[PDB]
Design a protein around this motif. Structure first.
Motif, PDB file in Angstrom:
ATOM      1  N   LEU A  99      43.447  42.205  44.952  1.00 45.83           N
ATOM      2  CA  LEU A  99      43.262  41.444  43.713  1.00 45.83           C
ATOM      3  C   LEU A  99      44.569  41.320  42.924  1.00 45.83           C
ATOM      4  CD1 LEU A  99      40.071  43.094  42.116  1.00 45.83           C
ATOM      5  CD2 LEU A  99      40.043  40.871  43.224  1.00 45.83           C
ATOM      6  N   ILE A 145      45.799  40.994  39.167  1.00 44.62           N
ATOM      7  CA  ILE A 145      45.217  41.220  37.841  1.00 44.62           C
ATOM      8  C   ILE A 145      46.007  40.415  36.827  1.00 44.62           C
ATOM      9  CG2 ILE A 145      44.396  42.947  36.206  1.00 44.62           C
ATOM     10  CD1 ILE A 145      44.956  45.046  38.280  1.00 44.62           C
ATOM     11  N   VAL A 152      49.598  41.889  37.761  1.00 43.96           N
ATOM     12  CA  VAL A 152      49.661  42.686  38.975  1.00 43.96           C
ATOM     13  C   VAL A 152      49.386  41.848  40.214  1.00 43.96           C
ATOM     14  CG1 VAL A 152      48.872  44.757  40.140  1.00 43.96           C
ATOM     15  CG2 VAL A 152      48.858  44.650  37.625  1.00 43.96           C
ATOM     16  N   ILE A 154      41.580  38.609  38.671  1.00 39.98           N
ATOM     17  CA  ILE A 154      40.648  38.966  37.587  1.00 39.98           C
ATOM     18  C   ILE A 154      41.319  38.856  36.240  1.00 39.98           C
ATOM     19  CG2 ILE A 154      39.183  40.476  38.905  1.00 39.98           C
ATOM     20  CD1 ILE A 154      40.571  42.783  37.223  1.00 39.98           C
ATOM     21  N   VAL A 155      40.624  38.231  35.294  1.00 41.27           N
ATOM     22  CA  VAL A 155      41.167  38.069  33.957  1.00 41.27           C
ATOM     23  C   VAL A 155      40.918  39.393  33.237  1.00 41.27           C
ATOM     24  CG1 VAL A 155      41.552  36.291  32.253  1.00 41.27           C
ATOM     25  CG2 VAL A 155      40.145  35.793  34.212  1.00 41.27           C
ATOM     26  N   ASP A 156      42.014  40.014  32.806  1.00 42.99           N
ATOM     27  CA  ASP A 156      41.960  41.331  32.184  1.00 42.99           C
ATOM     28  C   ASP A 156      42.713  41.479  30.859  1.00 42.99           C
ATOM     29  OD1 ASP A 156      41.547  44.023  31.835  1.00 42.99           O
ATOM     30  OD2 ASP A 156      42.149  44.565  33.863  1.00 42.99           O
ATOM     31  N   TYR A 158      34.117  42.297  37.930  1.00 45.68           N
ATOM     32  CA  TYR A 158      35.219  42.101  36.977  1.00 45.68           C
ATOM     33  C   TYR A 158      35.057  40.640  36.636  1.00 45.68           C
ATOM     34  CZ  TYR A 158      37.530  46.374  38.490  1.00 45.68           C
ATOM     35  OH  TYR A 158      37.773  47.699  38.776  1.00 45.68           O
ATOM     36  N   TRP A 159      35.885  40.116  35.754  1.00 45.06           N
ATOM     37  CA  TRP A 159      35.821  38.699  35.438  1.00 45.06           C
ATOM     38  C   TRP A 159      36.799  38.115  36.446  1.00 45.06           C
ATOM     39  CZ3 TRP A 159      32.830  35.548  32.764  1.00 45.06           C
ATOM     40  CH2 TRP A 159      31.993  36.104  31.785  1.00 45.06           C
ATOM     41  N   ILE A 199      45.548  47.023  45.271  1.00 44.23           N
ATOM     42  CA  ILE A 199      44.172  47.346  44.900  1.00 44.23           C
ATOM     43  C   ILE A 199      43.385  47.560  46.180  1.00 44.23           C
ATOM     44  CG2 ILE A 199      42.106  46.488  43.700  1.00 44.23           C
ATOM     45  CD1 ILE A 199      44.687  47.163  42.078  1.00 44.23           C
ATOM     46  N   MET A 251      51.358  46.342  42.940  1.00 44.22           N
ATOM     47  CA  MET A 251      50.407  47.428  43.118  1.00 44.22           C
ATOM     48  C   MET A 251      49.265  46.949  43.962  1.00 44.22           C
ATOM     49  SD  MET A 251      49.610  50.524  41.154  1.00 44.22           S
ATOM     50  CE  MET A 251      51.226  50.651  42.045  1.00 44.22           C
TER      51      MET A 251
END
Lengths: 95, 241
Positions: free
Chosen positions: B213, B215, B133, B124-126, B100-101, B206, B204
């Motif tokens: 993580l 998010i 999250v 992670i950048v999403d 992921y990033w 992961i 949440m």
């Protein structure tokens, strides 16, 4: 990373790209948390609202298209997203 | 007219999610994360676009032009950064796990006096997720500090009127600290002539080894000009101009 937390219903980062020659335009969601590109297919299994309003890919109308056929089916969180792989030239943006 | 990524493999969906999950507006998804998380080892667009050497620099950026009535969907730039999109300079963070990033979060601090990801963590950048999250036991506390109200089923509601007074939350990235105001982290909805204000955080968990993580969704990204760099494997942020 579960698809529940994924926007997709009100994603903020989308734009138009093209697949095939001539390019066929599709608005997709630019998603830095995944690594695959997929668009609706003209050969949709059901004639539902999804197949109605969305833009679907037609390889018959593409001079660059190359068959692949590896069928796929991942259970995209809520349901299952299924179709098949295909090769072609992507254009960004489309128009 | 723009660029042409040749020989790209992609997916034609013969069966896909409903309008309730993917809106009438979007036809498909174009993932921009590393090949490692690519379904069926299919080389991602940007990668191919990298191999075919179609852009000056293997990087891209998202500007959420969310200012007046600009083009909805933000503005993505493949190839480089553009001064006009930011104020000052960009600060980068090295990508920690090339899937992921993903990068390293130092700590999240809530105005009140609460601190989460106290000894640092993974984030992670999403651009595809909206909610911010985080670990539930950790975010449960944040939901508390900002005075959100847990309902059955999951939504932590916030009185629409009280929003303006909620504590700003600040994430510490690369030693730098990026701010988030309630107006920015409080997702609102409107139905049949009524608005509903609720928290933009998501509790949440992961499941590892990818998780734990945090998010970082668009509640954060819409605020800062974000640059994803493949040449150097880093992610940079600058105050969105």
């Amino acid at each position: 990373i579960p698809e529940v937390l994924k926007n997709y219903m009100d994603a903020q980062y989308y734009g138009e790209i093209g697949i095939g020659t001539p390019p066929q335009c599709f608005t997709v969601v630019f998603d830095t948390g995944s690594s695959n590109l997929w668009v609706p297919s003209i050969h949709c299994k059901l004639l539902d609202i999804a197949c109605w309003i969305h833009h679907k890919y037609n390889s018959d109308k593409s001079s660059t298209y190359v068959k692949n056929g590896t069928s796929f089916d991942i259970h995209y969180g809520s349901g299952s997203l299924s179709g098949y792989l295909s090769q072609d030239t992507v254009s960004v943006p489309c128009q | 007219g723009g660029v042409k990524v040749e020989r790209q493999v992609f997916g034609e969906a013969t069966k896909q999610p409903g309008i309730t999950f993917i809106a009438a507006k979007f036809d498909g998804i174009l993932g921009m994360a590393y090949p490692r998380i690519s379904v069926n080892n299919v080389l991602p667009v940007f990668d191919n676009l990298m191999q075919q050497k179609l852009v000056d620099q293997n990087i891209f950026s998202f500007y959420l032009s969310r200012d007046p009535d600009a083009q909805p969907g933000g503005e993505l730039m493949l190839g480089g950064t553009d001064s006009k999109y930011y104020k000052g300079s960009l600060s980068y963070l090295n990508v920690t796990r090339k899937a992921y990033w993903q990068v390293h979060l130092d700590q999240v601090e809530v105005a009140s006096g609460l601190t989460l990801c106290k000894e640092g963590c993974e984030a992670i950048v999403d651009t595809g997720t909206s909610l911010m999250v985080g670990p539930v036991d950790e975010v449960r506390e944040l939901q508390k500090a900002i005075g959100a109200v847990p309902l059955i089923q999951g939504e932590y509601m916030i009185p629409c009127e009280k929003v303006s007074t909620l504590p700003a939350i600040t994430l510490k990235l690369g030693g730098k600290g990026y701010k988030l105001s309630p107006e920015d982290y409080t997702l609102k909805v409107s139905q049949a002539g009524k608005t509903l204000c609720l928290s933009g955080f998501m509790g949440m968990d992961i499941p590892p080894p990818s998780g734990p993580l945090w998010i970082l969704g668009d509640v954060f990204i819409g605020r800062y000009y974000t640059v994803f760099d493949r040449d150097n494997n880093r992610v940079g942020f600058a105050e969105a101009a």
